[PDB]
Write an enzyme that holds these catalytic residues in place. Structure first.
Site, PDB file in Angstrom:
ATOM      1  N   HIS F 146      27.526  39.616   5.675  1.00  0.00           N
ATOM      2  CA  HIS F 146      27.923  38.732   4.584  1.00  0.00           C
ATOM      3  C   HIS F 146      27.549  37.270   4.799  1.00  0.00           C
ATOM      4  O   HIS F 146      27.777  36.463   3.894  1.00  0.00           O
ATOM      5  CB  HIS F 146      29.441  38.825   4.343  1.00  0.00           C
ATOM      6  CG  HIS F 146      29.904  40.182   3.917  1.00  0.00           C
ATOM      7  ND1 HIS F 146      30.492  41.075   4.788  1.00  0.00           N
ATOM      8  CD2 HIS F 146      29.858  40.803   2.716  1.00  0.00           C
ATOM      9  CE1 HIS F 146      30.792  42.186   4.139  1.00  0.00           C
ATOM     10  NE2 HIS F 146      30.417  42.047   2.878  1.00  0.00           N
TER      11      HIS F 146
HETATM   12  S1  FES Z   1      30.663  38.584   8.034  1.00  0.00           S
HETATM   13 FE1  FES Z   1      31.082  40.243   6.661  1.00  0.00          FE
HETATM   14  S2  FES Z   1      31.254  41.641   8.345  1.00  0.00           S
HETATM   15 FE2  FES Z   1      30.778  39.993   9.717  1.00  0.00          FE
END
Ligand code: FES
Ligand code: HEC
Ligand code: HEC
Ligand code: HEC
Ligand code: HEC
Ligand code: HEC
Ligand code: HEC
Ligand code: FES
Lengths: 423, 181, 235, 423, 235, 181
Positions: F146
């Site tokens: 993400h």
């Molecule tokens: S930032 Fe979404 S899982 Fe590590």
């Protein structure tokens, strides 16, 4: 007559907006307030037992499959992972394994109750057909399942009960190979069996759906050769709550005994040799497949051209019908004739509670069943061969000839009227 | 036309349905990894002639047992009469009579037969493994699945098993080896 | 008499000193040939059986053979999470993980270990490399001892295992006469543990369930007797 | 009106002895000769497509399970055994994998057809509820299934879509561990998923049973805001043979395209990284779970406190509602609001073919769906964050506020009468 | 131009001479570091690809490394039924069984093997133990070649594989200029085989099904047009 | 009585049902074979300080990375302000501020901290594995699931990940070893 009492959806606004999906209408009008006679003994419970046992098996299996690994190298290990590490383990496995035993025990009493009180007689043929279909499915299921632990009895039971299909000529080896996934037994067979074993129960439930639909449309049999006199029927109390509670009481007792077994006598119905891993190179003594297939195993391994009543020497007229094929046909017929019964009993009468000769022959039949059960475990050496031959012959004789003769000359009894038997 | 068009649509639907169904029934057949089904070199290598020798192959055991004189004489003293299967199932030769001279085995690349006999350890009734080491009522093999008595040379006797123990195609590797396949 | 064990009944949750004695014997005698792969080393702390001290378990584990790895081939330290070793061949025997169920079970082991007496007066010479056992039934028999139709006239048969113990093979730390019979009983109980570790939980569940279901069934019987009263009163 | 035409069982003796089991009565009277309007466009076919696709998936899966071995060390190998040795192999796998894609594509068109022609409006609430329940079940199924090959994307998709359940406070880690069978992913998770994945389809079929029961009791929507005028109904031709044949024609076309894909573009919808075995120690770039979950993935990873419209800084009033939990609630709500729709649209009107403003908003909604699909694959770097936030906001706005305002001031159209639209 | 292969399209059933050349290349070059466990050796006789002579397959198999056993630990003769060996670590690389799908695939391998030119004029010194490729994108890059925000200014990156071939590494028995480009194409096709052996069957099934379903659909369209005729004639 | 008896039967049925259901929900919990969850001895053994070291344990990776001066100075020059998680997740000590002096690691059994840092390579967002080797917009780790940017010492920055990279309980084995657990 046949009061459905749909409830008219007059309860309230909730029961009025439910005019979108009828469902509660179905339940109430049909599957709960189904008029059942008052004359029911304790033999009309085993259907509830079977339904509950089926649910139990399905649940426990869905749980086990979360830890069972279908493969020759990891099945035994997974079973032990279950019985040791998992939280409940032994419980699920013992409840799954033994519950199969209860399932078949309960269907036996369900079926023999039927043969007595003319439940196969018209107008209840469809129920009988569906029940035999089920019996077949559940036998095949239990067979596929006894294999999964990949013990020692698994392998050899599979071997023989697949060599059967290969006995027949022309299309025997092809079917054998197409079923085992190869020339002999190996992981492929295991995968097939696991899948299949994890799928048929749902077909059984559907077939149970039709089984229940049929005998709701067709009235429950009753100890007497009489119907609910639809034309208002002071007899025929409803199902709920009376018979529901009666069946639940009997079911509580049965589960009590079943759990006592599971907790004190769990390895009793089993074969110890199924606790040693498999060796395709060594066969143990007295394979003894199981206890709910011994009758047909015996009917199979009886005909061997070793008696003066040996019809194999006569069937050898055609060079194709050898012994093996003869025994296989004999077993398939042992079941097909039980299915054909309702069109063999040429009697315009009903429950054998008013047919004495039928009572005697029927108790002889029960004894024959028990004997066959006890004989499939004992060797084919004298005298057991004569015993097995006699028993199979009587089974076939009953179901083919005995019932017509009775239907002809079997009415020395005063039939009871007024299914309201206030005695 | 009404009849032609309707019936032809039905026929095409049926054909497509069958062409789709066949593979669902074909996948269950032996896969290519099972197609292999090749040979094995087992070395007799002095295993004390007379007791037995078993080896895995094709998923079934292949019995290689030396001969004990008493076992031999019992064999050679069996007339074809009263012999259930007199075909000598051994596929290394034609359908010659099930005689011990033909039924024992090739001769080490030499000239002798009454000393070794390698057959497929699979009961012809339904495929169980008979128990060896002199058992049964004929001094041979006994099948515990249904009670089939085999003789010294492996010919079926006293039971439902229709035929004797087959003999795969095998030749010798010059006095210490066996070729199975 | 039959020398019944503790667990032989509706009670008997595996007297643990017996199991510690069986362990002292198994690791010092039977382990030389036999194994128990189906048995983790971390079960010697789980309740029900030998509730040994974990640290001793880790020590005893590291003191065993080397089980290499599953990811990177390298002889490790045989961590407890692994399973007991496996003796496979060349003068070795089967696995005793569930031998107490593949046969009334433990009585077989007791009456088997018990009984290796000399060869009887039918074949005193016996056999070379094979030894005689009173209760094993799946062994060979000389032709001198068989009857006219292949059946043996001896009680047992010839087993490939030698006599495992003498008069006083090992010492017990708790203080107890370590004769052959006591050791046999103890090791039988240990193997039964290795096979059925969850026995006591089985029994307790059975008790609880019998009770609850008897209660439910009684209440349902009362309800039935009530509902069916106005229809079974005049007769 | 609602002519069932039970057929009166007057055909012959066969159709008269079938008075034991009604079955053919059901089929004929209800599920074949169900009066359906004439005004049906090509958007009322996708239900047949969904039923056929479900059957296809169930069949192909039952076949694969005969060769798939659930275990970390033998899953990949079994999949290759399938695609190489087995006779049909690649076909079953590609048909199983891609057919999931078609399944979801078809449900999307099935659902959006519904939102347009007021199929959620009364009296068709139960169908909508059941459909959302199904959607949930089939999403969970496809998720459990993408894991079985034990590739690389399997592992990490499972990791994150299980960390979700752990985000919530108090009962997050417990649920996570109870679902994974442990702290992290391993064979236990695989067994659970296989079992579960091999069981839910039957629940879906039953739910499809109720789905079909509902809209047979409740009339099929029709292009207009009109009913079949029950009171005799020259409109409303039957289902068989007309609409059966129409749907089968469309289905043949769809299967044609589907097999062309399977045979020329099979690895197109997939992720290549799922062809490399798993490494719990190395994560690839752009996991990109799949294409039928990108909308909700984006709705999830949008709210991060990175915009002036960031409601996370305001939801932080309560110290428990952090970002993660907020996104999870946002996704669950994105679905719950779609389920609640029929009680939000305050319009005594029907199909948007007579509601222009609704047409515009609805096409904007379709565009929003496509955009969300395209955004879940692209990083969270500017400008995509603003885009995702806008799209999620519009989704929620539509389903919460837009429909009430319309139902208030959205009747500048002449509704059509006489569902017999002979134009 | 793009040097399209034979199978790149609705046809192109894996010209087999190309695959035999790729096999000459793979067993003599790539096999030193790489493996293909997911590939049985017997597949070198199955139709579709190299339909070699079985006897040569058994010879080439016995001439490979020793795959010990699954039941009895003992270095066997490595029968064809087993799989290709596996090179795992210590200067070795991944498995090429399905590398033609984990990336338009084979074009990656071609344009990767093709391209190992010297270090550019941003970091001519390069790196010790690592070599440069113009197409691999998952390798490290020196800080001298990165932009202001970590992105690389080079087309490719630094791969741990050395240049596999020179100007004329091996001879072709059929007779053909064995330059680097032809070898790269051939080995790419061989790997695509190793990954998708059932390609041609795929295409033939697709053809058959497209045809049958077009037929069925046409017939259903006629049936529909007919049935719906008396209701769509006046308008 | 009517009411009492009926309601009591219902209650008993419910109790039995629940006692039967609970294990169907208990079996899915971590089994004893997963209960183990013990330690691992990783040997630093001269892996060329400054790049990285990863080892499997508990099913998750344990990052052991030496320190590069530029990475260090960037670390030590981070005031607690503008630091998302200032708790120093490391469980080998109390909730002391997320400072590099406390956040790097024990001192080899000696006295120094700005040279080694072993943390749990598991993103706190949803458990992905961030990419190391100097990545992201802060010269540390980057999560590709993400987009969460970690810093030199592992404290979370620039993303949804709420907290930094935890630090398990670990002590040294006298200058060449690490004890994880
Ligand atoms: S930032 Fe979404 S899982 Fe590590
Ligand atoms: C090698 C020196 C052994 C030691 C020490 C022990 N056992 Fe053993 N055992 C061994 C062999 C080779 C066999 C096979 C015997 C055969 O004829 O096949 C066995 C067998 C057993 C059995 C199984 C008996 C059966 O009915 O199959 C048991 C229950 C057994 N052994 C128990 C046992 C115990 C408790 C030991 C320690 C006290 C022990 N054995 C030691 C080899 C050896
Ligand atoms: C050792 C001397 C090698 C020989 C000879 C060949 N390969 Fe290799 N290869 C090797 C290593 C150590 C690596 C990993 C590179 C890295 O930076 O991680 C590789 C990689 C490949 C790849 C994958 C490239 C990718 O994008 O990940 C391919 C497709 C590849 N190698 C092909 C290949 C071929 C066709 C070879 C024979 C002509 C060959 N390699 C030889 C090590 C070695
Ligand atoms: C959801 C899966 C599932 C269902 C449904 C199921 N079982 Fe099983 N069954 C298993 C598993 C897993 C095993 C292997 C583990 C075991 O033996 O307990 C098994 C094993 C068995 C065994 C051998 C038991 C043993 O321990 O050797 C029998 C007998 C059996 N099944 C019969 C049945 C019958 C009869 C039914 C229903 C008609 C049924 N099963 C329903 C999963 C299931
Ligand atoms: C081969 C015969 C057969 C089999 C097997 C069988 N049934 Fe029946 N069943 C019958 C017959 C006959 C009746 C009597 C119907 C009647 O009286 O109208 C019956 C009646 C019933 C009834 C209602 C009355 C009663 O006897 O309880 C139930 C409930 C029932 N069956 C359930 C089941 C279930 C559940 C199964 C299997 C899981 C099963 N049955 C298997 C033949 C069978
Ligand atoms: C009888 C078993 C079974 C049924 C029913 C079934 N599948 Fe599967 N599914 C499998 C097996 C086995 C695999 C692993 C083999 C594979 O990936 O093809 C799998 C894998 C998958 C995959 C991953 C495909 C891949 O190759 O990565 C998806 C997606 C999937 N299933 C979705 C579904 C959906 C959606 C349904 C129905 C709603 C469904 N499946 C029905 C058995 C089944
Ligand atoms: C979330 C919503 C939703 C989902 C998912 C859904 N349905 Fe429907 N379905 C509907 C609605 C609304 C209708 C319209 C009913 C009406 O017009 O009376 C409908 C109608 C139908 C119809 C008859 C008319 C038509 O549109 O073809 C069939 C057949 C059908 N659905 C099958 C299925 C099957 C099979 C599935 C899944 C495997 C499915 N549906 C999934 C909501 C849904
Ligand atoms: S199987 Fe060998 S005799 Fe029946």
């Amino acid at each position: 007559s046949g009061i459905p009492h749909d409830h008219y959806e007059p309860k309230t606004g909730i029961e009025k907006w439910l005019h979108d999906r009828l469902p509660i209408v179905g339940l109430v009008y049909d599957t709960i307030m189904i008029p059942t006679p008052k004359n029911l003994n304790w033999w009309w419970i085993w259907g509830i037992v079977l339904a509950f046992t089926l649910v139990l098996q399905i649940v426990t299996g869905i749980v086990l499959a979360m830890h069972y690994t279908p493969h020759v190298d990891l099945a035994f290990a997974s079973v032990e992972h279950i019985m040791r590490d998992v939280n409940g383990g032994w419980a699920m496995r013992y409840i799954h394994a033994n519950g199969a035993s209860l399932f078949f025990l309960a269907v036996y009493i369900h079926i023999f109750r039927g043969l007595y009180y003319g439940s196969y007689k018209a107008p209840r043929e469809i129920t009988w057909i569906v029940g035999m279909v089920i019996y077949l499915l559940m036998m095949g299921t239990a067979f596929m399942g006894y294999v999964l632990p990949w013990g020692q009895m698994s392998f050899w039971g599979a071997t023989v009960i697949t060599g059967l299909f290969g006995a027949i000529p022309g299309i025997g080896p092809s079917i054998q190979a197409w079923l085992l996934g190869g020339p002999a037994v190996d992981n492929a067979t295991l995968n097939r069996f696991f899948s299949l074993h994890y799928l048929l129960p749902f077909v059984i439930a559907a077939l149970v759906a039709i089984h229940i639909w049929a005998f709701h449309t067709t009235g429950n049999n009753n100890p007497t050769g009489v119907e609910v006199r639809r034309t208002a029927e002071k007899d025929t109390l409803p199902f709920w709550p009376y018979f529901v509670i009666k069946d639940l009481f009997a079911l509580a007792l049965v589960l009590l005994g079943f759990f006592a077994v599971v907790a004190y006598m769990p390895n009793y119905l089993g074969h110890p040799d199924n606790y040693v891993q498999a060796n395709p190179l060594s066969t143990p003594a007295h394979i003894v497949p199981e206890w709910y297939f011994l009758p047909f195993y015996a009917i199979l391994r009886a005909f061997a051209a070793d008696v003066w009543v040996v019809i194999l020497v006569d069937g050898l007229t055609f060079g194709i019908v050898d012994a093996k094929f003869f025994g296989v046909i004999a077993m398939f017929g042992a079941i097909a004739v039980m299915a054909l019964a309702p069109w063999l009993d040429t009697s315009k009468v009903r429950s054998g509670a008013y047919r004495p000769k039928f009572r005697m022959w029927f108790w002889f039949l029960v004894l024959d069943f028990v004997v066959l059960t006890w004989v499939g475990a004992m060797p084919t050496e004298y005298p057991y061969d004569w015993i097995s031959l006699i028993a199979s012959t009587y089974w076939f004789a009953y179901f083919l000839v005995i019932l017509p003769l009775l239907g002809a000359t079997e009415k020395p009894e005063p039939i009871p009227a007024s299914i309201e038997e206030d005695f | 036309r009404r009849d032609f068009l309707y019936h032809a649509t039905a026929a095409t639907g049926v054909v497509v349905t069958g062409a789709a169904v066949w593979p669902l029934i074909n996948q269950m057949n032996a896969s290519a990894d099972v197609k292999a089904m090749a040979s094995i070199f087992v070395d007799v290598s002095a295993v004390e002639v007379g007791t037995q020798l078993t080896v895995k192959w094709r998923g079934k055991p292949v019995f290689i047992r030396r001969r004990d004189e008493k076992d031999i004489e019992l064999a050679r003293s069996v007339p074809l009469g009263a012999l259930r299967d007199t075909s000598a199932e051994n596929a290394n030769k034609p359908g010659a009579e099930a005689t011990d001279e033909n039924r024992t085995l090739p001769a080490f690349d030499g000239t002798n037969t009454g000393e070794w006999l390698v057959m497929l350890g699979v009961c012809t009734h339904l495929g169980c493994v008979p128990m060896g080491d002199k058992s049964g009522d004929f001094g041979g093999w006994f099948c515990p699945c249904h009670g089939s008595h085999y003789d010294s040379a492996g010919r079926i006797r006293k039971g439902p098993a229709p035929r004797n123990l087959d003999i795969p195609v095998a030749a010798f590797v010059d006095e210490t080896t066996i070729k199975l396949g | 008499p039959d020398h019944a064990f503790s667990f032989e009944g509706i009670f008997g949750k595996y007297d643990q000193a017996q199991l510690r004695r069986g362990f002292q014997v198994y690791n010092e005698v039977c382990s030389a040939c036999h194994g128990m792969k189906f048995v983790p080393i971390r079960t010697l702390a789980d309740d029900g059986g030998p509730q040994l001290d974990p640290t001793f378990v880790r020590e005893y584990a590291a003191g065993l053979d080397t089980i290499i790895d599953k990811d990177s081939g390298e002889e490790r330290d045989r961590k407890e999470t692994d399973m007991f070793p496996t003796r496979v061949g060349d003068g070795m025997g089967p696995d005793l993980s569930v031998m107490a169920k593949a046969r009334g079970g433990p009585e077989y082991i007791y009456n088997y270990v018990i009984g290796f007496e000399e060869n009887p007066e039918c074949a005193p010479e016996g056999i070379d490399g094979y030894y005689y056992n009173k209760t094993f039934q799946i062994g060979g028999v000389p032709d001198t001892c068989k009857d006219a139709a292949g059946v043996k006239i001896t009680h047992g048969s010839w087993a490939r295992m030698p006599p495992p113990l003498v008069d006083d093979q090992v010492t017990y730390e708790d203080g107890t006469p370590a004769t052959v019979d006591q050791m046999a009983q103890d090791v039988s109980a240990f193997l039964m543990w290795a096979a059925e570790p969850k026995l006591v939980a089985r029994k307790q569940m059975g008790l609880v369930a019998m009770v609850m279901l008897g209660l439910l069934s009684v209440m349902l019987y009362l309800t039935n007797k009530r509902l069916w009263a106005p229809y079974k009163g005049h007769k």
